[PDB]
């Protein structure tokens, strides 16, 4: 229906704060958390993966390489899955952009220890 | 409708015998052979591939790597495609689990001659 | 509805000339340009990619490796995307087959400078 699950009380507060973009006027809302869950199940991917910091990582991994080959439907996903994942880990970005940079750098560190 | 095609007379006998799980009470039935064919065509994959030992291998190959990234919809597939494939090859497992081990080991042998 | 967009006036002329096959009697028509656009959006891929020589390349890249693992739905795509791409680049093949050879050879050249 429209209840909490993916994000807890504390996460919800920050979530509503985070904005979809750095230079916008539309904060994040449950509409985005559910909008992704629906598109997820469509790709044979349960929405529960978003409720777990581990499940999200698995999703971003498939969408990562499918960022250029993927379509708009995939782009939006990476946006939500990003801001959400950051919440489950620790990163408390203000927008969806900052979340992309953080996750982008974290991957660059592993490159040195996984080349 | 509900006739034979993927599995012949002899294969049908063994199929009905094989169980979906090692510790269960629900043997295999045509319902599972058709249930997969439907999900197959959905992924741009003709159900006929299951009627051929060659087609199955091609399917298990894509689902193999998509076992962790894939969703529940993919899991069930690997289960049926497994028990079925084993029938077309030679392996006559009793459950779906044994089929996974057999196919798992067969792949380990090639690793030594394809590393 | 049924207007021009992907192929311009000049491209349209050649398009209608090109045949789906070398030994057939069914030339190409808008029906094929739209038929693909529909299947594209289904895979999270905007149909606009076909209107751009760059977008097409990105599509053929994903379908390339998915030529054997992919289903019939993918085959038809590679057929249209091929004849179309050739138009945006320069190749003016007469059928869909010739388009496959041209794109096949072009990739062989890069192999020598990208092995
Ligand atoms: C007399 C009254 C006259 C005024 C009323 C006349 C109509 C009127 O309202 O103004 C037109 C428009 C603003 O209205 P408008 O609804 O088109 O605003 C843009 C629209 O929402 C886009 O979808 C946004 O980009 P995206 O979805 O996030 O990609 C874009 O954001 P930004 O990201 O740009 O901030 C928004 O500016 O002005 C411009 O700034 C366009 C500059 C080009 C910018 C577009 C290039 C991104
Ligand atoms: C049962 C029916 C249920 C469906 C109807 C329920 C409501 C519904 O329509 O879906 C919600 C929404 C799409 O609708 P929605 O109008 O909110 O679409 C977004 C909105 O226009 C933003 O302003 C765009 O960013 P910007 O102005 O250019 O910055 C953003 O573009 P992209 O640039 O993201 O492509 C658009 O996706 O889904 C998502 O994809 C959000 C993922 C987070 C992405 C936002 C992070 C940028
Ligand atoms: C007074 C009468 C009181 C009795 C009636 C009260 C209700 C009652 O019938 O008993 C409860 C239940 C058995 O009934 P219940 O329908 O829940 O049985 C389980 C259910 O079908 C699961 O979906 C099966 O796992 P999966 O889909 O294949 O994954 C699981 O199989 P196994 O694979 O476990 O054999 C089944 O046991 O007992 C337990 O054994 C649970 C232990 C935890 C096991 C679950 C962890 C897998
Ligand atoms: C037009 C509508 C047609 C659709 C309605 C037609 C009937 C229909 O509903 O679909 C059939 C069936 C799903 O329904 P169905 O209730 O049989 O689902 C399975 C059943 O509950 C088993 O007991 C589960 O295993 P276990 O108790 O935990 O061991 C198994 O889980 P997984 O662990 O497999 O996820 C479940 O999938 O499809 C398949 O996926 C079978 C693939 C073989 C998988 C079985 C091998 C484990
Ligand atoms: C008294 C009147 C009797 C005559 C009326 C009796 C019925 C009658 O019309 O003739 C039968 C048939 C021609 O008619 P028919 O509609 O079946 O023609 C074939 C049909 O359209 C296939 O789908 C085409 O292959 P694909 O979709 O592109 O793959 C095939 O093309 P090609 O690519 O073969 O040119 C077509 O020939 O004859 C043969 O040539 C078959 C030889 C085997 C060829 C099939 C192997 C590809
Ligand atoms: C809203 C509903 C809209 C849908 C209804 C609108 C009309 C509609 O039905 O779809 C159009 C068409 C499929 O229908 P359509 O009857 O034209 O199908 C093709 C036709 O039979 C050819 O003769 C076949 O080649 P050949 O005789 O064996 O040589 C070709 O096979 P393949 O060998 O290609 O598999 C068939 O796909 O789509 C495409 O895939 C064309 C892609 C270009 C492929 C052609 C290049 C070979
Ligand atoms: C929002 O309220 C989340 C609930 C998701 C919808 C559940 C629908 C009801 C479950 C039982 C119906 C199954 C019919 C046998
Ligand atoms: C079970 O009976 C397997 C048959 C699959 C359904 C076939 C449907 C009938 C074929 C002709 C209908 C096409 C309409 C032009
Ligand atoms: C063929 O004519 C190409 C046009 C594609 C269909 C567009 C449908 C009309 C657009 C506005 C409808 C949206 C409802 C708010």
Automatic annotation (TrEMBL), chains A, B, C:
Entry annotated with the keyword Membrane: yes
Gene Ontology annotations for the cellular component aspect, listed alphabetically: host cell nucleus; host cell plasma membrane; host multivesicular body; viral nucleocapsid; virion membrane
Record GO terms (molecular function): ATP binding; RNA binding; structural molecule activity; zinc ion binding
Origin: domain of life: Viruses
Biological process according to GO: viral translational frameshifting
Chief localization: host cell
Subcellular location as annotated: Host cell membrane; Host endosome, Host multivesicular body; Virion membrane; Virion
Keywords in alphabetical order: ATP-binding, Capsid protein, Host cell membrane, Host cytoplasm, Host endosome, Host membrane, Host nucleus, Host-virus interaction, Lipoprotein, Membrane, Metal-binding, Myristate, Nucleotide-binding, Phosphoprotein, Repeat, RNA-binding, Viral nucleoprotein, Viral release from host cell, Virion, Zinc, Zinc-finger
Name under which the protein is recorded: Gag polyprotein
Organism in which the protein naturally occurs: Human immunodeficiency virus type 1 (HIV-1)
């Amino acid at each position: 229906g429209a209840r909490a699950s993916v994000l807890s009380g504390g996460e919800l507060d920050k979530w509503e704060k985070i904005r979809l973009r750095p230079g916008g006027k539309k904060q994040y809302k449950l509409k985005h958390i559910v909008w992704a869950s629906r598109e997820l199940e469509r790709f044979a991917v349960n929405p529960g993966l978003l409720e777990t910091s581990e499940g999200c990582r698995q999703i971003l991994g498939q969408l990562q390489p499918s960022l250029q080959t993927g379509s708009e439907e995939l782009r939006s996903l990476y946006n939500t899955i990003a801001v959400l994942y950051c919440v489950h880990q620790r990163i408390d970005v203000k927008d969806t952009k900052e979340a992309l940079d953080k996750i982008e750098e974290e991957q660059n560190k592993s490159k040195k220890k996984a080349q």
